Structures are given as structure tokens and as C-alpha cells.
Amino acid sequence: GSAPKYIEHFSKFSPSPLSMKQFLDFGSACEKTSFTFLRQELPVRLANIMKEINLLPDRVLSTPSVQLVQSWYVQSLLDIMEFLDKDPEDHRTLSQFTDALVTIRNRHNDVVPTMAQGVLEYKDTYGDDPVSNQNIQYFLDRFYLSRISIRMLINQHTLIFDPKHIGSIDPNCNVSEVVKDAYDMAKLLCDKYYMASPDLEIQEINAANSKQPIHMVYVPSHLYHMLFELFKNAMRATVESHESSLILPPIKVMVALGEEDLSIKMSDRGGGVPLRKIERLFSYMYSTAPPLAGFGYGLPISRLYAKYFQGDLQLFSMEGFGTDAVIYLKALSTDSVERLPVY
Amino acid sequence: GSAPKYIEHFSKFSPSPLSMKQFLDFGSACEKTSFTFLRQELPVRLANIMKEINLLPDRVLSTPSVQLVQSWYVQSLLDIMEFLDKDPEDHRTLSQFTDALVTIRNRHNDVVPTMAQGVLEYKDTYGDDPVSNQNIQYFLDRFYLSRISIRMLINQHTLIFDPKHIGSIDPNCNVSEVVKDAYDMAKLLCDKYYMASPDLEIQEINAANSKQPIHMVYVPSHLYHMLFELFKNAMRATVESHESSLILPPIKVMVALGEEDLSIKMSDRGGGVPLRKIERLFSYMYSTAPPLAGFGYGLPISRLYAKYFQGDLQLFSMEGFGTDAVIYLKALSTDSVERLPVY
Ligand SMILES: Cc1cnc(Cl)nc1-c1ccc(N(Cc2ccc(CNC(=O)C(F)F)cc2)C(=O)c2ccc(O)cc2O)cc1
Ligand SMILES: Cc1cnc(Cl)nc1-c1ccc(N(Cc2ccc(CNC(=O)C(F)F)cc2)C(=O)c2ccc(O)cc2O)cc1
Ligand SMILES: CC(C)c1ccc(COc2ccc(CC(=O)NCCN)cc2Cl)cc1
Ligand SMILES: CC(C)c1ccc(COc2ccc(CC(=O)NCCN)cc2Cl)cc1
Ligand SMILES: [Mg+2]
Ligand SMILES: [Mg+2]
Numbered sequence: 001g002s003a004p005k006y007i008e009h010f011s012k013f014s015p016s017p018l019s020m021k022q023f024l025d026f027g028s029a030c031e032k033t034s035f036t037f038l039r040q041e042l043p044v045r046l047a048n049i050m051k052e053i054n055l056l057p058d059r060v061l062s063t064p065s066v067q068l069v070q071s072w073y074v075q076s077l078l079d080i081m082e083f084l085d086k087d088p089e090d091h092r093t094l095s096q097f098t099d100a101l102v103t104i105r106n107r108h109n110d111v112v113p114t115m116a117q118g119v120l121e122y123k124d125t126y127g128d129d130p131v132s133n134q135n136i137q138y139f140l141d142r143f144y145l146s147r148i149s150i151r152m153l154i155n156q157h158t159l160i161f162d163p164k165h166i167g168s169i170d171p172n173c174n175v176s177e178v179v180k181d182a183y184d185m186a187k188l189l190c191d192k193y194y195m196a197s198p199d200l201e202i203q204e205i206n207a208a209n210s211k212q213p214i215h216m217v218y219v220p221s222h223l224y225h226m227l228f229e230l231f232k233n234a235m236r237a238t239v240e241s242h243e244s245s246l247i248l249p250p251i252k253v254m255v256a257l258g259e260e261d262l263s264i265k266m267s268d269r270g271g272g273v274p275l276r277k278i279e280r281l282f283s284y285m286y287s288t289a290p291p292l293a294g295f296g297y298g299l300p301i302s303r304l305y306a307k308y309f310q311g312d313l314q315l316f317s318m319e320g321f322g323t324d325a326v327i328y329l330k331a332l333s334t335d336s337v338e339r340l341p342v343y
Numbered sequence: 344g345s346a347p348k349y350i351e352h353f354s355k356f357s358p359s360p361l362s363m364k365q366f367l368d369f370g371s372a373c374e375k376t377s378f379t380f381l382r383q384e385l386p387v388r389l390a391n392i393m394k395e396i397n398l399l400p401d402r403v404l405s406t407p408s409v410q411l412v413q414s415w416y417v418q419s420l421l422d423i424m425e426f427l428d429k430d431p432e433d434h435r436t437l438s439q440f441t442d443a444l445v446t447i448r449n450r451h452n453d454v455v456p457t458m459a460q461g462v463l464e465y466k467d468t469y470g471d472d473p474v475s476n477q478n479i480q481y482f483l484d485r486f487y488l489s490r491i492s493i494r495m496l497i498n499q500h501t502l503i504f505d506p507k508h509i510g511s512i513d514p515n516c517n518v519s520e521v522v523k524d525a526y527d528m529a530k531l532l533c534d535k536y537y538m539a540s541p542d543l544e545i546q547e548i549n550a551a552n553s554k555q556p557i558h559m560v561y562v563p564s565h566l567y568h569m570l571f572e573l574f575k576n577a578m579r580a581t582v583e584s585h586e587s588s589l590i591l592p593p594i595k596v597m598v599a600l601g602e603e604d605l606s607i608k609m610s611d612r613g614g615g616v617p618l619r620k621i622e623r624l625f626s627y628m629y630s631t632a633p634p635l636a637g638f639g640y641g642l643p644i645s646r647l648y649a650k651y652f653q654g655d656l657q658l659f660s661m662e663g664f665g666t667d668a669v670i671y672l673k674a675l676s677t678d679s680v681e682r683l684p685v686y
Contacts, residue, residue: 207614207663258662261617265661271550274604275655275671312618316659316669318608319601320550324667326659328618 003074006081007054010047015149017338020169020217020309023156024333027166032088034157035097039083042153046077048343049146056139059126065118069111076104098161101154111147112298115140119288133285140284142341145304149340152219152308173218175255175264176202182227183251190235193291198238198268199250206257214257217333222305226313229296230266230325236292237270237323262331269322278315309336346417349424350397353390358492360681363512363560363652366499367676370509375431377500378440382426385496389420391686392489399482402469408461412454419447441504444497454490455641458483462631476628483627485684488647492683495562495651516561518598518607519545525570526594533578536634541581541611542593549600557600560676565648569656572639573609573668579635580613580666605674612665621658652679 026034050073053066060066079100086093119136126132152168159167183200190197206212234251242248249269256263273281280286282300297305303313310330317323330336369377393416396409403409422443429436462479469475495511502510526543533540549555577594585591592612599606616624623629625643640648646656653673660666673679 205661205664254661254664256615256661256664258615258617258664260619261662263618263661263663272599272601274601275606276603314659316657316667318548318597318599318606318669319604320606321548321597321599321601324659326661 001078003077006043006077007047007050010043011051011343013044013047014342015045015048015340016041017340019338020171020333020336023169024166024171024217026156027160027169031094031161034161035083035094036088038153038157039080039097042080042150043077045146045150045153045340046073046080048341049073049143050077051343052139052142052341060118060122063118063121065114065121069114072107072111076107079104094161098158101158105151105154105158108147108151112301115143116284116288119284120290123285123288128285133283136285137283141300141304144301145308145339145341148304148308149338152338168219168221169217170220171217173216173220173223175214175216175223175262176204178220178223179227179253179255179264182224182231186228186231186235189232189292189295190239194235194239196239196248198235198248201250201252203252203254204256205254208257208259214255214262216262216329216331217336218309218329222308223327223329225297226302226305226327227264227266229299229302230327232292232296233299234266234268234270234323234325238268241269241271257331260331260335262329264327264329266325267322272317272319272322273315274319275317278317281315307339310339344421346420349386349420350390350393353386354394354686356387356390357685358388358391358683359384360683362681363514363676363679366512367509367514367560369499370503370512374437374504377504378426378437379431381496381500382423382440385423385493386420388489388493388496388683389416389423391684392416392486393420394686395482395485395684403461403465406461406464408457408464412457415450415454419450422447437504441501444501448494448497448501451490451494455644458486459627459631462627463633466628466631471628476626479628480626484643484647487644488651488682488684491647491651492681495681511562511564512560513563514560516559516563516566518557518559518566518605519547521563521566522570522596522598522607525567525574529571529574529578532575532635532638533582537578537582539582539591541578541591544593544595546595546597547599548597551600551602557598557605559605559672559674560679561652561672565651566670566672568640569645569648569670570607570609572642572645573670575635575639576642577609577611577613577666577668581611584612584614600674603674603678605672607670607672609668610665615660615662615665616658617662618660621660624658650682653682 050070053070053073054061056066083093083097083100086097088094122132122136156167156169164170164172179202180200187197187200204214206214231251238249238251252267254265256265282303284300287299296302306313306327306329312328313326314328315323315325393413396413396416397404399409426436426440426443429440431437465475465479499510499512507513507515522545523543530540530543547557549557574594581592581594595610597608599608625646627643630642639645649656649670649672655671656669657671658666658668
């Protein structure tokens with residue numbers, strides 16, 4: 001077959017980041033335009049990450065975990081190749097494409113738990129030294145980022161071509177709302193497994209406008225994933241740190257709108273982490289092994305979601321007291337451009 | 344002369360970090376022991392940083408700014424060479440040594456404003472690209488760290504051999520006190536140049552012991568420098584951000600003692616910094632150029648002081664609202680070991 005050639009060809013191209021502007025504009029008339037873009041762009045992006053996978057050392061490459069996903073990405077690449085010469089003006093060519101994208105979405109779901117298994121085999125088969133950890137961290141952050149960028153495109157298509165929301169984007173996303181729901185659901189799982197649960201104090205700061213509710217252009221699902229992961233972490237720590245005592249501090253959130261950053265601090269009084277152990281929480285390796293630990297996207301993955309549109313997600317803590325966690329986003333849709341790894 | 348040989352010889356040795364334990368123990372009887380240690384150790388440390396200076400590219404090496412300090416370090420090295428074969432049991436050999444250390448302390452004072460001039464010439468003579476900034480940052484952080492480690496030794500000696508304080512160390516340092524003084528003095532300069540000034544809310548958390556005042560083993564001068572720099576930064580931002588308005592939020596500090604970290608958050612509601620501009624505040628380059636900006640040690644240098652005994656100093660902010668700044672220290676004197684750059 002052709003995978004390596006197909007790959008080697010498309011990895012000459014550089015992926016094309018989009019802004020929310022461009023994403024929004026694809027959703028006003030335009031189906032066949034989305035198509036001619038994506039049949040080009042998906043192979044580029046697929047190929048680039050496939051090129052980097054195949055540069056991994058053979059002792060990783062050859063693990064069952066990796067070989068399995070290398071297999072998935074190959075099918076997907078090809079599935080989308082089929083369409084490179086099909087004719088855009090055919091109201092049926094466009095339709096078996098969309099089916100084709102969904103079929104590809106389903107293949108790819110179990111990718112997280114699969115890589116973990118590779119991470120795990122690697123830890124027990126070669127070790128957990130710091131130099132290993134840098135390589136794994138390096139490669140997963142890129143891989144997982146790439147993968148998020150592909151999902152973004154695919155959902156954008158399938159969701160539009162099956163007013164208000166434009167696919168997965170909400171041009172009038174109400175940050176407070178997303179916060180309250182992540183909390184209510186976290187609260188739910190907390191009340192179940194613990195039989196106490198912190199309250200929530202939201203506070204807003206709209207610097208420019210004094211007192212408007214804080215709205216933004218974003219992908220609310222991403223922001224929900226992020227907030228959820230954090231609330232879960234805060235609740236666990238708050239609740240267990242105070243089993244012996246009665247009084248249970250709330251989790252406070254502040255949501256601050258400046259001239260370029262829209263930021264979201266979440267503060268717990270859960271007893272905190274010593275500075276030395278904090279980088280650990282972001283490491284795929286030091287955090288994989290075999291109560292409400294089964295829920296949520298992971299801390300490293302939450303952070304990628306923020307980096308994905310030029311944000312970040314940082315933790316800082318005070319041992320003996322508790323932890324702040326902050327999500328940094330771009331206030332301006334203009335500055336919200338995809339972040340993508342290269343070659 | 345011999346400088347390059349002397350240098351090449353001593354740069355084979357690795358500097359020897361000390362704990363507060365070892366520092367304290369030098370100060371109970373022991374003068375001539377401090378001497379035989381220091382005549383060895385100072386040359387090692389002097390030599391190592393001198394070796395790294397001389398590995399700088401000739402277009403930096405040759406600037407007047409650098410050549411001047413390369414000259415100072417050489418004299419100092421030699422001044423201390425004189426003593427390598429003098430006889431420890433001579434109650435006068437020990438005495439012209441101490442004089443010799445002070446003489447060396449005075450030579451070295453204007454080193455900060457001198458390097459700035461090299462930084463400045465370099466910025467206008469070759470540029471301020473990011474790759475330059477990494478090199479400067481790299482080299483000054485090490486240089487300035489080294490220099491702090493030498494001063495530490497020298498003061499330790501001169502201060503002991505001219506109960507309670509043991510040189511520059513206070514084995515019962517009361518953190519709250521150091522905080523209040525840094526504030527009162529900052530408040531002073533603020534009241535002078537601005538004619539309003541925030542109040543201060545200290546709060547303590549002693550996790551282990553419920554309610555004891557929080558004491559520690561530290562070098563209070565370092566901690567005062569640090570706190571001062573921060574208070575100045577917070578006050579400026581708080582005061583100017585609210586000129587148009589009436590109400591003036593206080594600066595709050597929390598001082599938290601855990602099982603290994605003793606931490607010190609200082610929170611302002613000064614309007615903050617956007618995430619993108621924050622690394623800038625730590626860069627020697629982006630922060631050198633030609634109201635109460637004349638006071639205090641610098642932000643990068645404050646941070647080194649914290650790293651010096653395995654701590655750190657971090658900033659995180661929320662544009663539209665304000666900034667947290669945290670000093671991370673080791674709670675345990677056992678974990679308080681000098682951090683030193685290598686070869
Ligand atoms: C990483 C993670 C994954 N899943 C779950 Cl349910 N929790 C965590 C997790 C949560 C909190 C922490 N800790 C450390 C921690 C661990 C346990 C406790 C509770 N105390 C005790 O169990 C007792 F032993 F002291 C408190 C704090 C934090 O300080 C913290 C980290 C991230 C965050 O967003 C919020 C945080 O508070 C560490 C890991
Ligand atoms: C770096 C520095 C050096 N010297 C002096 Cl006096 N101040 C600063 C400095 C102080 C505050 C900031 N800003 C940014 C800043 C700048 C100006 C303002 C005031 N607002 C205005 O001037 C108005 F134009 F908006 C507010 C915040 C902060 O957010 C900040 C940084 C560090 C810190 O410890 C505490 C901080 O608050 C930046 C630089
Ligand atoms: C499970 C998956 C995500 C996984 C697991 C583990 C790894 C680890 O990859 C490593 C580990 C060490 C080195 C250093 C070295 O000696 N390099 C020379 C290379 N020949 C390079 C790489 Cl790529 C990556 C990806
Ligand atoms: C003022 C003092 C502190 C100062 C000022 C400026 C610098 C800058 O030093 C640089 C700048 C660029 C490079 C890249 C390069 O091209 N390297 C090849 C080197 N030949 C290396 C170095 Cl050491 C250091 C110290
Ligand atoms: Mg962090
Ligand atoms: Mg920082």
C-alpha cells in the first residue's frame with residue numbers, strides 16, 4: 001500500500017491554524033468549501049503526527065499500544081484520501097464524506113486509555129527516570145494537541161452539515177453558566193461518594209465594563225471539561241482534608257475580563273501541595289498507574305485544551321492551606337487562533 | 344601573572360553547598376576552621392564563575408563593562424591566594440585575612456549597575472532578539488547566583504569573627520515581623536511619592552500547630568529584600584490603578600507553614616498583567632533601560648535569593664484585577680542547602 005508515501009508527501013505541508021473568525025465564517029451556504037479545505041487539511045495534520053510517531057525509538061514503536069493507533073490513523077488517512085479527486089458539485093459526494101468523518105470519529109475514541117497502556121508498559125519495561133518523562137511529556141503533549149485539532153475540525157463539519165451555536169462554538173458563551181454547571185455536576189458526584197460538599201462562590205470582574213455579565217466566543221465543551229476536572233480536584237481535597245473537622249470552606253471562583261486575557265481562578269482551602277510535587281500532576285508518566293478518580297479528562301489534557309486557543313492552565317498552591325488553579329483564555333476572538341505542533 | 348592557571352586549576356573542583364546546619368555550626372571556638380575552609384572554597388567558587396565568564400563570545404567579553412568585573416574577580420582571587428600557605432595557628436594570619444575579605448566585599452558592590460551597562464550596550468549594539476535574551480538570562484542568573492553564594496560566605500565570616508543571631512542568619516526569624524517592616528518602609532516611600540498608600544492584611548496558617556507564631560531559620564536580610572521589592576511593586580500598581588477612584592484596596596499577605604514549604608503570598612488588586620507580558624518582568628534585558636523605581640534589588644534578583652536556599656518566587660496575575668506573588672521557602676533547616684551553579 002501507500003501509507004508511507006502518502007505520509008511523506010503530506011508532511012511536507014504545514015498545518016493551517018484557524019481563528020474563531022474563520023471557524024464562525026464556515027458556518028453561515030458553504031458546505032462544499034468546508035469539504036475542499038478538509039480533504040486537504042486533514043491529511044496534512046494526520047500525516048504530521050504520523051510522521052512524528054514513526055520517529056519514536058523501535059522499543060516504543062513496536063509496543064502493541066502504539067502499533068494499534070498507528071493502524072487507526074492509517075485507515076483514517078486513507079478513508080479521506082478516497083475523496084481527493086471526487087467532485088465537490090455532487091450533492092452525494094459531500095454526503096458520503098460526512099459519513100466517512102463520523103466513522104473516523106468512532107475509531108479514535110479509545111486512544112487515551114490505549115496510550116496509557118504504552119506508558120505503563122514502558123514504565124515497567126524500561127523505567128521512570130526523569131529523561132524518559134521529558135520524552136513522554138514531549139510526545140504526548142504534541143500528539144494529544146494534534147488530536148484535539150483534528151476533532152475540532154471534524155466536529156465543526158458534522159455538526160454544521162447534518163443562528164445561535166455554530167457547531168461546537170458559542171459566540172455568546174456565558175462563562176458563569178459554564179462554571180455553575182461544571183460545579184453542579186461535580187457537586188453531584190461529590191455528594192454521592194462523600195456525603196458532604198463545598199459550596200461555590202462565583203465573583204466576576206469586568207474591567208472595561210464595570211458590570212456586564214462576562215460573555216465570550218469559545219467552545220464551551222472544552223471549557224466545561226476543564227472546569228469539571230478542576231472542581232473534582234478541589235472537592236476531593238477540600239472534603240478529605242476536613243473529615244476530622246466540621247466547618248467546610250467553599251470553593252471560590254473569580255472570573256476576570258481584561259483587555260486581552262479572560263482568566264478563571266478557582267481557589268480551594270484543601271491543604272495544598274508542596275511546590276516540589278506540583279509538576280508531577282501534569283506528567284502523564286508520574287500520573288498513570290493500574291474514589292471519583294474515574295471522571296474527567298485528566299489535568300494534562302485540560303491544560304492542552306487551554307493552550308489550544310493560545311491559553312494556559314496553571315496551578316499554584318500553599319502547603320498547609322490550599323490551591324489556586326487558573327485558566328487563562330484570550331478575551332478577543334481575533335487572538336483565538338489554533339495552536340498546533342509542527343513537523 | 345597566573346590568573347588563567349589559578350583559574351584552570353580551581354575550576355576542576357566542584358563548589359561545596361552548605362546547609363543552615365553547617366552555617367550555624369561554624370558559629371559556636373572555630374575561627375581557624377572557617378579560615379582553612381574558605382581559603383579553599385572561595386577560590387573554587389571564584390574560579391568557576393570566572394571560567395564561565397571567559398567562555399562568553401568575544402563581542403561580549405571585550406566590552407568595557409565585562410573587562411572591568413573580570414578585573415575585580417582576578418584581584419579578589421589573588422588576594423585570597425596569598426593565604427593558601429600562611430599558618431592557621433597564627434592569631435595574626437587570621438586577622439589580615441578578615442581585613443582581606445572586607446576589602447574584597449567593597450570592590451564588588453557596583454557589579455549590578457556595571458552589568459546593566461553591558462546589557463545595555465549589547466541591546467543597542469547587537470539587538471534584543473529572544474535568542475539573545477535566553478543567553479543573557481542564562482548567564483546572569485548563574486553569575487548573580489554565584490555572587491550571592493560568595494557574599495553569604497564572606498559576611499558569615501566577617502560578622503562572626505570581628506547567642507541570638509549567628510551572622511546574617513536568625514535561627515528564630517519571625518516571618519510576620521519581617522513582613523511588617525518591609526511594608527512600613529515601602530509605605531514610607533509610597534506615602535512620600537504618592538500621598539495615598541494601601542493598608543496591609545497579614546494572616547497566618549500554621550497547619551501543624553494550629554496557632555503558634557510562624558518562626559523559621561533564615562537569612563532575614565534576604566527575605567527583607569524580597570518582600571520589599573514586592574511591596575513596592577504592589578503599592579505602585581495599586582495606587583496608580585486607582586487614582587481616578589476613591590476606595591483603595593489593601594495588600595493582603597498570607598504566610599502558610601506546611602510540612603516542607605513555608606510560603607508567602609502577597610495579593611494586590613492593582614489591575615494586573617496579561618499573561619503574555621509576565622516572563623518579561625523577570626528578564627534582565629527587557630527590564631534594563633536608561634517614580635520609586637530606584638529602590639529594591641530587582642525582581643530577577645529577588646527570585647535568585649529564593650532559589651538560593653531551594654525556594655522560588657513566582658508571579659501569577661489576572662488582568663483586570665491584580666496580581667499574586669508568592670515566595671516559596673523550605674520550612675526545614677535540613678532542606679535549606681545552598682543552591683549553586685556548576686562548571
Ligand atoms: C490529581 C487528582 C486527580 N483526581 C482527583 Cl479526584 N484528585 C486529584 C488531586 C486533587 C487535589 C490534589 N491536591 C493535593 C491534595 C491531596 C489530598 C488532599 C486531602 N488531604 C488528605 O487526604 C489528607 F491526607 F491530608 C488535599 C490536597 C491539590 O492540592 C490540588 C491539586 C489540583 C487542584 O486543582 C486542586 C487541588 O487542591 C492533588 C490531586
Ligand atoms: C516591575 C516594577 C518595577 N518597579 C516598580 Cl515601582 N513597579 C514594577 C511593576 C509593578 C507592577 C506591575 N504590574 C503591572 C501593573 C502596572 C501598572 C499598574 C497601574 N495601572 C496604571 O498605571 C494604569 F495605567 F492602568 C498596575 C499593574 C503588576 O501587575 C505587578 C507585578 C509584580 C508585582 O509584584 C505586583 C504587581 O501588581 C508591573 C511592574
Ligand atoms: C506510550 C507512548 C506515548 C510513549 C512511551 C514512551 C516514550 C518514550 O520515548 C523515549 C524515551 C527515551 C528517549 C531517550 C533515548 O535514549 N533516545 C534515543 C532514541 N533511539 C527517547 C524517547 Cl522517544 C514515548 C512514547
Ligand atoms: C552584559 C553581559 C551580562 C552579557 C551580555 C550579553 C550576553 C549575550 O551572550 C550571548 C548572546 C548570543 C549568543 C548566541 C551565539 O550566536 N552564540 C555563539 C557564541 N560565539 C551567545 C551568547 Cl553568550 C551575555 C552576557
Ligand atoms: Mg504550574
Ligand atoms: Mg512565573
